[PDB]
Amino acid sequence: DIYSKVLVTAIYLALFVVGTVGNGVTLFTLARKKSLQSLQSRVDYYLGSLALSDLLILLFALPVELYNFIWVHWAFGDAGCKGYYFLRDACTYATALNVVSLSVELYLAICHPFKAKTLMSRSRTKKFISAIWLASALLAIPMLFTMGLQNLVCTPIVDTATLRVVIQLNTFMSFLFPMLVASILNTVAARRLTVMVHQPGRVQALRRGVLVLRAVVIAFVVCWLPYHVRRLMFVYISDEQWTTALFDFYHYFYMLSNALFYVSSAINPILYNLAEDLVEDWEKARKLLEAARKGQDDEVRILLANGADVNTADETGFTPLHLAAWEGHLGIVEVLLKNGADVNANDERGHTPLHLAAYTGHLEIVEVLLKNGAGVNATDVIGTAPLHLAAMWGHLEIVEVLLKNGADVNAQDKFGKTPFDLAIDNGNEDIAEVLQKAATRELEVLFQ
Ligand SMILES: COc1cccc(OC)c1-c1cc(C(=O)N[C@]2(C(=O)O)[C@@H]3C[C@H]4C[C@H](C[C@@H]2C4)C3)nn1-c1ccnc2cc(Cl)ccc12
């Protein structure tokens, strides 16, 4: 139908530009990045080799299928008819062999790190990626002789029996065999790394390579499995003609698998980067929360430089600033604020860093917070404000600073207690006297 033609055409154009940009940016990045780790540079060479095959499908295969299949009712020549299937077949091999070769290098590095250290270099990996690309072209040569131009339409130039044989072998050799090998090696590599880790940043690269691979495998398996199942349906089909429902099913499934093929190649960079960056982000986030609390000045400085989230909140809603303000680390509080730390950050109860700074009696930090635009009158779910906690725990110095920055003396909590009530009940006579004076500010100012 026309609705289906418009739907699919839009998806192809979306996949094309996003895939071309994504894989295009990837190649530029990985080509022009200087990784300070031998193993991680080799992982990049494989992702660069995958980005190349991803781009060839999107620039040479997608437009032909878009044009000479769905969009319009053949005009790419015999070279194009043969070239299309050859190039598409070649890329799928190059992908499957890149994923296997990568999974092999990771497996050896984890299970045999001693041998892998001496018997693996960037030059050796560059040698195999060539071999992968050269072997891919070698295995894809049969497709040049199975499809040809006749009448002008691009149709098979061999009997269905012979065509069934090459397609069957292709699906097994190009997908089923390698993907399973990659999957097993990846699964085993991940398990033995856990044991290997338990016993400078080689483990991070090995952890990154496993995550990257795992996601890249799942993406291409999920996306090409329907496409290859379809090709096995072709070779193992029953008699001519079936129920209209069955014809509708195979037609939709054919049209679907066609589209799903280009999904994998398009959003692969985004998917493996997202997954890898999520773990690295979460890691650096939790490292910052502990470094900020423990009082590690150097650790916090490095982690913020490495691009850790300064405003990251924990399960209880605490940011690095909350704990740094609580534990009384003035050096870190300033460093955090300089890096754009949210000074009015809330938690589960709705406490700000100023609530915690006042409670623990950190005068110097209380000022630096306020100086950087901290809410002096900020209240929690109970209705407690910094002035309540400062007066409560007998911190006269802070009470003066808070009042000096316009702290509400009449502010009450759920229990109907003012900062004065807390000061009096806690036997803080010194604080309570200043609070009663502050309350009579309006009276004295005008009259006197
Ligand atoms: C008997 O084949 C199937 C049975 C059930 C479901 C099917 O597709 C989901 C298929 C199927 C697969 C292919 C299938 O994979 N074409 C090719 C491809 O690359 O896609 C074409 C055509 C040949 C040479 C070459 C490589 C193969 C096989 C290009 N084509 N194809 C179909 C063949 C015949 N009639 C069909 C009718 C319907 Cl409604 C749907 C699919 C049909």
Swiss-Prot record:
Residues 31-44, 105-124 are cytoplasmic. Detected in brain and small intestine. The chain crosses the membrane at residues 10-30, 45-64, 83-104, 125-145, 165-189, 212-233, 252-272. GO terms for molecular function: G protein-coupled neurotensin receptor activity; identical protein binding; protein-containing complex binding. N-glycosylated. Palmitoylated; this is required for normal localization at membrane rafts and normal GNA11-mediated activation of down-stream signaling cascades. The palmitoylation level increases in response to neurotensin treatment. It is found in: Cell membrane; Membrane raft. It is a multi-pass membrane protein. Keywords: Cell membrane, Disulfide bond, G-protein coupled receptor, Glycoprotein, Lipoprotein, Membrane, Palmitate, Receptor, Transducer, Transmembrane, Transmembrane helix. Residues 65-82, 146-164, 234-251 are extracellular. The keyword Transmembrane applies. Disulfide bonds join C81-C154. GO terms for cellular component: axon; axon terminus; cell surface; cytoplasmic side of plasma membrane; dendrite; dendritic shaft; dendritic spine; membrane raft. One of its GO terms (biological process) is regulation of respiratory gaseous exchange. The ligand binding pocket consists mainly of extracellular loops ECL2 and ECL3, as well as transmembrane regions TM6 and TM7. G-protein coupled receptor for the tridecapeptide neurotensin (NTS). Signaling is effected via G proteins that activate a phosphatidylinositol-calcium second messenger system. Signaling leads to the activation of downstream MAP kinases and protects cells against apoptosis. Belongs to the G-protein coupled receptor 1 family. Neurotensin receptor subfamily. NTSR1 sub-subfamily. This is Neurotensin receptor type 1. It comes from Rattus norvegicus. The lineage of its organism: Eukaryota, Metazoa, Chordata, Craniata, Vertebrata. The gene is Ntsr1.
